Amino acid sequence: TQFEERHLKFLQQLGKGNFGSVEMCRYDPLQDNTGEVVAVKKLQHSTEEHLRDFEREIEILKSLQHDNIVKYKGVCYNLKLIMEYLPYGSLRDYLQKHKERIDHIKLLQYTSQICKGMEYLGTKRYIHRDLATRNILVENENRVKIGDFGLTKVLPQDKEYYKVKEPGESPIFWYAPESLTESKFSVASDVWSFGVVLYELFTYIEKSKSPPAEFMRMIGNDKQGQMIVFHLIELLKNNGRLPRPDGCPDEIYMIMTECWNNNVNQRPSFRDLALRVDQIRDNMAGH
């Protein structure tokens, strides 16, 4: 549960995301090259505010035990979070690399797993706030896991939403309209973002088809910066939405459009999304 820095052998930089950085290391206390490979998360720049947020993130991950949630292994005290290493990396990269071999029934198997991991977060009153394929990891060809909790918040005991406005770049093209306008995050805004994840999956991460590329096309690429959010809010209010991805069945696009309801209370639950996705999977498989 306690890892010693001296036995953490650097192997490679895996990625960066919102003030965090993840590396692949071998934890080799015997110094005989038999230790397991682990993923290590650290702050790119240490500040008291980022350290307090990182400590809360660690406590959140340690509290989660689910097949579709990356496993917490421990800490290294320059605080570092030690997690299991997942050999296939992000679902965003994996899908882009294997698009010719991943069919719709496989995309739905991954979709169902993301729904189950999200419903489990919901039982703990945790709001992920950053659902996107870049934040989902691939354990093997048959299993994905929610792979980062850097923006995850715990709902207050007496409210169904949490208001936050973080400095830094926010993933506005995955945000629910009430998150853009009122900085309100909830299980319902995670469902909106889940709809964007489902869109990402069915586009197979085709560059010109990404949510930022499609929304910027609809808003106009000429739009400033501070004005992008303003125009995005107006577009969503007017029921402007990401288009049906090429080859996506109507039934699947309908799930996305239902997640993208402006009325927060009308969005489906993660339990109903899992039922719906599993029913469609069953239909496609015949059994």
Which residue numbers are catalytic?
A: 130
CB-side exposure of 228: number of CA atoms within 13 Å? 16
According to CB under 6 A, which one of 8, 22, 121, 205 is a site residue for ligand 50V? 22
Number of residues that bind ligand 50V (CB under 6 A): 19
By CB under 6 A, residue 135 contacts ligand 50V: yes
As given in the structure block, the two tokens for residue 200 are: 């990402």
Beta bridge partners of 84: 38
Instruction: Specify the pairing of strand 80-84 against strand 72-76.
Output: antiparallel
Q: Which of 89, 213, 223, 231 binds ligand 50V (CB under 6 A)?
A: 89
Of residues 86 and 280, the one with the C-beta less far from ligand 50V = 86
Strand order of the β-sheet with 37-43 is: 8-17, 20-27, 37-43, 80-84, 72-76
Ramachandran angles phi, psi of 83, nearest 5°: -130, 165
Query: Which one, 57 or 214, has the nearer CB to ligand 50V?
Result: 57
In the block, tokens 């029913």 appear at: 279
Q: Binding ligand 50V by CB under 6 A: which of 57, 148, 178, 190?
A: 148
Min CB(152)–ligand 50V separation in Å: 12
CA 163 to chain centre: 19
Exactly one of 58, 76, 86, 115 binds ligand 50V (CB under 6 A); that residue is: 86
Helix, strand or coil, per DSSP, at residue 172? helix
Q: Does the annotation list 21 as a binding residue?
A: yes
85 binds ligand 50V (CB under 6 A): yes
> According to the binding rule CB under 6 A, does residue 70 interact with ligand 50V?
yes
Supply the minimum distance, in Å, between the C-beta of residue 110 and ligand 50V: 15
In the complex with ligand 50V, which residue's Cβ is closer, 131 or 264?
131
Residues 6+ apart with CB under 8 A from 140: 87, 88
The answer to the question of residue 83 lying near ligand 50V (CB under 6 A) is yes
Instruction: In whole angstroms, give the CA distance from residue 24 to residue 14.
Output: 6
DSSP conformation class of 8: E
Mode of pairing for the β-strands spanning 184-185 and 143-146: unpaired
Query: Residue ranges for the binding site for ATP?
Result: 14-22, 41
Query: Residue ranges for the binding site?
Result: 14-22, 41
Residues that bind ligand 50V (CB under 6 A): 14-17, 20, 22, 39, 70, 83, 85-87, 89-90, 135, 137, 147-148, 150
